[PDB]
Amino acid sequence: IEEGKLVIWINGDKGYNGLAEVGKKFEKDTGIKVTVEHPDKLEEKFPQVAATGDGPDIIFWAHDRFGGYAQSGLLAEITPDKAFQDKLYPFTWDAVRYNGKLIAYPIAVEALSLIYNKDLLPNPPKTWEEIPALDKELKAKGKSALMFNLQEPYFTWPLIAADGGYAFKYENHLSHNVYIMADKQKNGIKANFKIRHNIEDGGVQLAYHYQQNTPIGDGPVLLPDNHYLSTQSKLSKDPNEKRDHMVLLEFVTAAGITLGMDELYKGVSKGEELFTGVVPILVELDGDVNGHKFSVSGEGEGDATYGKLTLKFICTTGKLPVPWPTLVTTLVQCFSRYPDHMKQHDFFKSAMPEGYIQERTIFFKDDGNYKTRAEVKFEGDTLVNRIELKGIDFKEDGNILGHKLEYNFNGGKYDIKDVGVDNAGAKAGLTFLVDLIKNKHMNADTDYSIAEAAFNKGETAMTINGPWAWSNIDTSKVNYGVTVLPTFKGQPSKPFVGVLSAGINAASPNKELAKEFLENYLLTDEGLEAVNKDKPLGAVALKSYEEELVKDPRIAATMENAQKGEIMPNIPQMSAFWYAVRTAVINAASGRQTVDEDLKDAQTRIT
Ligand SMILES: OC[C@H]1O[C@H](O[C@H]2[C@H](O)[C@@H](O)[C@@H](O)O[C@@H]2CO)[C@H](O)[C@@H](O)[C@@H]1O
């Protein structure tokens, strides 16, 4: 990659001539040349060429591809300052966050709308179900009802998702519950639970945990009734830290015993006093996994009144030989928030200051096991967790010693084993589409060019497209409207919402130049206007400019369809999702197999 200039890749359906104008302004101010290209298949080309250390400085695509690029080490982390972050909408920054890092600049929000010819169809349809009849009426007059790209599953997905189709199931319960039981003959507690570790490229690695805790001291402890600890964890990194490390934020609350009405009728351990405020924490772990010896040190603080832990861990021996997420559980349940009515069940604090021994065995399914023994106690003002870990029977090339686990915890934000492409709602929607074809209301071979030319020539009354398409319709002089997509079985069509984003190649020697361009030239009112005037971007990420665009009814329609849809995940598994659904739609549409069979195939490919 040549130093001292910028090469930018953007898709050929976007305003690349307008983006080139912004490049020319950058060159007028700086002397630096900005070359804008639109290669074919750039979303497949980029990971190929970047993996060898080549390609553009800056890559534009919808946000859904960027997680995969990021997981493959192809994107530089961006760290705009807070003054710049405040210029863009938070919804858009969320779309470019990946396992704790911002991995691109967001540009604009894209959602499909129904685009209609007001001369042919002054009142467009509310439902998919009425389209066959409208088509029959229009065909009698030499026109058709609807043409849109049937080759890319982006454009059929709104109908597939309408009555219940989905890619990956969003985890609505992000806390993980660990059930605590009294262990009377150890005068302590025990627990067993499992952790899910997403594997890169798909699949889940299970870690079955078995735990026993015993007081160090001879003083009385609290032995609890059955209950649980509900834990949420967030793993991140410190941009200024050069060693191998993990930043961890956790929140933990006890639950599972409801107060009875008898307790209202006519209606704390000494160790608990040590946890009324912020307590410093130190963690030290000496480990040996298949003979690979390592040490970890951690420091931070706990606040049991919130159930909150904030810690940074460092591998003090160089590269950690196992993945960080596999050590989270091993690396202080005394910081749990127990509700007042449950505090007689808090073994962990009752054992302080002398502390407890915490022992586990952790079995990684179809791989090795960890055995851990820890002393958790106060040393002065500080709560210290000192751990010995021994790992055996691991595969040197397996998910743990081969570092094949995603950097997230307990499955992350989507259940990548729960795919919705072959459920009743997906089948109903694709069956409707295939029926449209069977009944000669659409043609299986229609693609983007064919549909755009028919709509822009006034041959078809409707199309389905994004904001980028509007300028060619303008040139055509068709009198058009942009509106809400039709309903299916009374439910909104649910387009997958994209955020056009600009990522920086990890191998670029022009990372600062790229940030200067993106922050001070593109992501300005004048920069966005220049692209927008070429091909409309949609609902832009820059607040100041979006305030001008919201008076356009086409933007209002875009937003209404975005609201009814769902933001695309940016998880690495999205690439497999889209490949599978593409094949399923093309095959079902051309009659190659039935709808049921094709969606079942898709589902098997993805999982
Ligand atoms: O069809 C699968 C395809 O859908 C999306 O791509 C969109 C893109 O977001 C729009 O900006 C535009 O160019 O149309 C594309 C459909 O042809 C996903 O972003 C993409 O990853 C996916 O492969």
Numbering used by the authors: 2 to 268, 275 to 338, 342 to 617
Give me lines lifted from the publication on this model.
We inserted cpGFP into the canonical family member, E. coli maltose-binding protein (MBP), at four different locations and performed high-throughput screens to improve the linkers and other sensor elements, resulting in relatively bright sensors with ΔF/F > 6. Finally, we report the crystal structures of two of the sensors in the maltose-bound state.
Typical metrics for quantifying local structural perturbation, such as changes in solvent-accessible surface area or distance difference matrices, identify residues for which the change in local environment is defined by the three-dimensional relationship between residues, but not their sequential relationship. Thus, we analyzed the change in dihedral angle (defined by the Cα atoms spanning four residues) to identify maltose-dependent structural changes in sequentially adjacent residues [Fig. 1(b)]; this analysis shows that the Cα chain is “torqued” around residues 175 (ΔDihedral = +41°) and 311 (ΔDihedral = −22°) upon ligand binding. MBP175-cpGFP was also screened with XX linkers, and a few variants with ΔF/F ≍ 1 were identified. We set up crystallization trials with MBP165-cpGFP.PPYF, MBP175-cpGFP.L1-HL, and MBP311-cpGFP.L2-NP in the presence and absence of excess maltose, from which both MBP175-cpGFP.L1-HL and MBP311-cpGFP.L2-NP crystallized in the presence of maltose. We solved the X-ray structures of these sensors to 1.9 and 2.0 Å resolution, respectively, by molecular replacement [Fig. 5(a,c)]. As expected, the structures of the cpGFP and MBP domains of the sensors are superimposable with published crystal structures of cpGFP (from GCaMP2; RMSD = 0.36 and 0.38 Å, respectively, for comparing 221 common Cα atoms) and MBP-maltose (RMSD = 0.43 and 0.37 Å, 370 Cα). GFP-H148, which H-bonds the GFP chromophore in the structure of native GFP, also directly H-bonds the chromophore in the MBP175-cpGFP.L1-HL-maltose structure [Fig. 5(b)], although a different rotamer is observed.
